[PDB]
Amino acid sequence: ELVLALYDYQEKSPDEVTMKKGDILTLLNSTNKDWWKVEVNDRQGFVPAAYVKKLD
């Protein structure tokens, strides 16, 4: 369940999390087609699904 951040994304609401391009994130929930829940270092939240790429 690893995904690569294709772009920077800065969180804009309570449920979101910030990532930087090239970060390797742990994918927690990909049930929604637009927003995926990931763990970015020590924080968890949503980012746009189109901005990350599954590695497996």
Alpha-carbon span 10 to 31, nearest angstrom:
21
Domains and CATH numbers, the chain: 1-56 (2.30.30.40)
Q: Give the start-end residues of each E strand in 6-51.
A: 24-29, 35-40, 43-48
Alpha-carbon span 15 to 9, nearest angstrom:
13
Resolution of the model in angstroms: 1.8
Neighbours of 12 (CB within 10 A): 8
Alpha-carbon span 54 to 4, nearest angstrom:
7
